[PDB]
């Protein structure tokens, strides 16, 4: 019968990626540290409220040679089993060719027929294998296509190559029998990026194919500097907000408003490829709240990129319940947020009233708790417009001990959406110590003293920015440096030193409390002298 | 072994089309009035100096139905026989899908897979059939592709469709075995037109395919108004000259100069689709001289469109030896031409010296003949710069009788290139007569009195142009009107009257002698009254 492609895509909301699994580059799907897929994982993801699952698959390393490129039947049966489990749990399912994109498909520019033969063979095999599967199984032509080994090197000829890949995929699937005459097909922009020319090119391809069951796909990992924590973008601010609005306005105008539905096939923050701790927690939450709201406004179905770091695949729970709670709330509507998820108290100072700005997002404050205890309006706190004041005696009750670090929590409750949690932290000025070391393993002894590090600047004392990405003084969190809180050390990485010339560099460590600490390093070959502020 | 595609295309020069033959829409190749192809025709064309032959083929009407679309083997064997004869005569050969373009291929926009299945099947069959043939046989994907039933309705989506047709053709041929891995392939622009965007799109496709044996093709039928004789363009003038220069500069810059050779797969004058007499003979000759010179300058191989009207296929000679002689001369270099191919003498007037402007094109005048008799320089004629004077006594010797029409010829001989022939014509004022008739068969009795008609204007006496193409007063020769010299009649066609409203129209007949005659028609329904000048 007829299929309503817009309703189909709407019914997928929200989605989840089985990341770093069948897409892993290796003998099998455990190559990147995830376990073999259990039925329970799929059940649990469905129970959390996900309505669709993307199962990215890298076929390279599980296929024979030319000319037929036979897919390993054992590998295919394992992929198949997971597809079936998902369908049994009433999920929509998307499969693709994944890291094949940069393992070999990218060669197409100087190997047209060679790539085409291999690509055709794979999609002929998959389309045939899955032809009688329910149409809740959809096919995606290729992940993040590009035709250079590098990102951001899209040339004019590349667009034509991607049109051809998308088109041959369409032709193969549509004429392969079973339900494949109507099965929804997912087609990407170049690099799954959102610039207007790339959206236009995908539109041209979709328009040409003259088919009612096509879905456009893009990916999104945040405004780059915020997403990796570089260049001073420690807060979710106007640049990150405007990129989302502008990008998804383009997507909506070009596709959704013209009747072509859009699946955001992957989203997250790029810096999570390091770890989730590289983005300040409150700012991370506000990114997800804002993004998902604006996707909802534009009818865009989204699928979380989860490489194993969000849903714990061994215990079937979220590593970060706060993040999940925010996402789950965002599926339904907006949550109120605040300038920060913390209130800092200087150890030794008289504790005063803390006033913080809320962004209510159309909700009302219903209550406040201090370590779970209900507070009395007026007596213990005030809300004046969007200015929330937590009274001194409440903070003193939580943190009069003056123990450094997080003493407790003030939780703001709203009539709709997720609670917002203020971590109440006692701090003193952090102290770094002079030291001497080697570029391969350089650690500054550091007393964090209840502080959390936001970012680090590096400049040559003689002038100019030092280290990687020297268009900015603010170095990249994790990549160039890392706080080791348990070890009481500040790590400066070998990658940092690889892009530092011999000489004297001034470091400036910025902490979330507002504390700033300077430090000097002198590099002489592979040897580094650290000198604390005096 | 390796093939040098530029040398290959150069070696094709000059070419000839076996037109209105296998391309004819009908049961067989005689459907449009040409005889079955004889070996002698191919021999004779080769003997005239042609090095390549285009054999356009329309496959529709000689194929089975879906899904395999089997080509009639009998038809294919007849095409094959002609290909073999041409190859035996050492010619290069181009075959294609021809009027399939507008019989069904154009449907692709709203029938993507249906057209693709049929197109794929045909090229699979042809590529297989011809795979072991010498590489002097080349394949051309499709004639004059477009995706509307009408010309000049190229939309953005159409470019993508043509890229796909060209690309699938490439893929099929290149992987079909025999010599087809290296066989030269000919790819057209949309409508085989020469505008920059269309040239760019073909370049993009050729660049993408990353193959050393690709040939670009365009067609050319002259600046439109001159080519059909409308809007007053009775002379080969600056607009026709500039179109050639601009168009082929674009072609050279975009393709030839970048190492992609170009075959002009068809050329002629569009109006020849009526008959060759619609273009004044001298102006026709200058068009071909100028065109072929500029193609030579730009290394473009050309193939004459001959639907049966140039080379007489029954007697194996040129209908118009003067035209052939000009083309043959042009293969080697430029010919000198003149303002006209005629000298008019008014009957009853004293015969004076005739002075005409020559365009020497780098040649020198070596002599002059009057009816074949060598004339004496100085005594009988003078050349002053490019001004040729033929003395009165020479013209009087040719035309003292005062018989109306062509009395004889003055032939200019040059050190290089074709002779130029001046027809010496005696004329009197032409006379049209009043009459009454019907729109389906309206003839003005006409005493042409040694004159040749150039064009006819039609305007409403109250204002505005009358008849077809009413953006100009000058009507289209043949289509709207025709001189019947033997019948002594001026025909105004039914097609003319279909676009004339009831009322009074002033006609102005322009003759090559400079004589102008006005005439009035009054249209009342299907009845027409003609009133001669008084
Ligand atoms: C390294 As990625 C663009 O697959 O998140
Ligand atoms: C009518 As034609 C464009 O094939 O000369
Ligand atoms: Ca294409
Ligand atoms: Ca609540
Ligand atoms: Ca001569």
Provide tags for this entry.
alpha/beta, Endo-beta-1,4-glucanase (Celulase B) (chains A, B), hydrolase (chains A, B), five-stranded mixed β-sheet, metal-binding (chains A, B), 3 domains, binds cacodylate ion, binds calcium ion, calcium (chains A, B), homodimer, eight-stranded parallel β-barrel
Explain what you see.
It is classed as hydrolase. Keywords: hydrolase, tri-modular. The assembly is dimeric. High resolution structure of the full length tri-modular endo-beta-1, 4-glucanase B (Cel5B) from Bacillus halodurans. 2 copies of one chain form a homodimer. The first copy, chain A, folds into 3 domains: 1-334, Glycosidases (TIM Barrel), CATH 3.20.20.80; 335-428, no CATH class; 429-534, no CATH class. The first copy, chain A, is of the alpha/beta class and 534 residues long. The radius of gyration of chain A is 26 Å and the shape is globular. Chain A starts with a helix and ends with a strand. Helices cover 28% and strands 26% of the residues of chain A. In chain A, the strands form 6 sheets. An 8-stranded parallel beta barrel of chain A has the order 1-2-3-4-5-6-7-8, surrounded by 4 helices. A 5-stranded mixed β-sheet of chain A has the order 12-19-18-14-15, covered by helices on one side. A 5-stranded antiparallel β-sheet of chain A has the order 21-28-27-26-23, with no helix packed on it. Chain A has 13 helices and 28 strands. In chain A, helix 5 runs parallel beside helix 6 (156-174) and helix 10 packs parallel to helix 11 (321-332). At the A-B interface, helix 5, helix 6 and helix 7 of A face helix 5, helix 6 and helix 7 of B. The complex binds cacodylate ion (2 copies) and calcium ion (3 copies). The site of one calcium ion (CA) has 2 residues of chain A, from strand 18.
């Amino acid at each position: 019968k007829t299929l309503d492609i817009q309703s189909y895509v709407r019914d997928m909301q929200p989605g989840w990626n089985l990341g770093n699994t069948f897409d892993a580059v290796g003998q099998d799907e455990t190559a990147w540290g995830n376990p073999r897929v259990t039925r329970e994982l799929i059940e649990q993801i469905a129970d959390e409220g996900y309505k669709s699952i993307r199962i990215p698959v890298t076929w390279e390393n599980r296929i024979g040679g030319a000319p037929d490129y036979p897919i390993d039947p054992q590998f295919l049966n394992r992929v198949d089993q997971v597809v079936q489990w998902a369908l049994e749990e009433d999920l929509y399912v998307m499969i693709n060719l994944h890291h094949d994109s940069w393992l070999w498909i990218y060669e197409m520019e100087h190997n047209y027929n060679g790539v085409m033969v291999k690509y055709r063979s794979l999609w002929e095999q998959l389309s045939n294998h899955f032809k009688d599967y329910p149409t809740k199984l959809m096919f995606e032509s290729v992940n993040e296509p590009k035709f250079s080994q590098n990102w951001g090197e899209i040339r004019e000829n590349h667009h034509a190559l991607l049109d051809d890949l998308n088109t041959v995929f369409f032709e193969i699937v549509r004429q392969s029998g079973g339900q494949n005459d109507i099965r929804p097909l997912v087609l990407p922009t170049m690099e799954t990026a959102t610039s207007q020319p790339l959206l236009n090119n995908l539109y041209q391809t979709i328009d040409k194919l003259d088919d009612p069951n096509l879905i456009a796909t893009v990916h999104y990992y945040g405004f780059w500097p915020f997403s990796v924590n570089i260049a001073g973008y420690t807060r979710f601010e106007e640049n990150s907000k405007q990129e989302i609005i502008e990008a998804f306005d383009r997507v909506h105008h070009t596709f959704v408003a013209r009747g072509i539905p859009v699946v955001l096939g992957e989203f997250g923050l790029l810096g999570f490829d390091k770890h989730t701790g590289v983005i300040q927690q409150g700012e991370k939450l506000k990114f997800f709240e804002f993004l998902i709201h604006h996707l909802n406004e534009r009818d865009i179905t989204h699928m979380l990129w989860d490489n194993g770091q969000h849903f714990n695949r061994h215990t079937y729970e979220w590593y970060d319940q706060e993040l999940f709670d925010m996402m789950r709330a965002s599926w339904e509507g907006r949550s109120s947020v605040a300038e920060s998820n913390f209130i800092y108290l200087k150890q030794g100072d008289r504790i005063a009233d803390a006033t913080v700005s809320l962004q209510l997002h159309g909700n009302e404050l219903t209550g406040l708790r201090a370590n779970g205890q209900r507070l009395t309006p007026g007596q213990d706190y005030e809300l004046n417009g969007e200015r929330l004041t937590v009274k001194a005696h409440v903070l003193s009750a939580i943190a009069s001990s003056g123990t450094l670090g997080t003493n407790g929590m003030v939780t703001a409750e709203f009539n709709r959406g997720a609670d917002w949690h203020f971590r109440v932290n006692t701090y003193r000025t952090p102290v770094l110590q002079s030291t001497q070391g080697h570029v391969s393993n350089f650690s500054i002894p550091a007393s964090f003293n209840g502080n959390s590090l936001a970012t680090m600047e590096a400049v040559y004392v003689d002038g100019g920015n030092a280290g990687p990405q020297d268009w900015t003084s603010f170095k990249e969190f994790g990549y160039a440096f890392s706080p080791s809180y348990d070890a009481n050390e500040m790590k400066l990485t070998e990658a940092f030193f690889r892009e530092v010339r011999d000489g004297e560099v001034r470091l400036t460590f910025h902490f979330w409390s507002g504390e700033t600490v300077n430090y000097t390093i002198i590099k002489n070959g592979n040897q580094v002298t650290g000198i604390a502020a005096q």
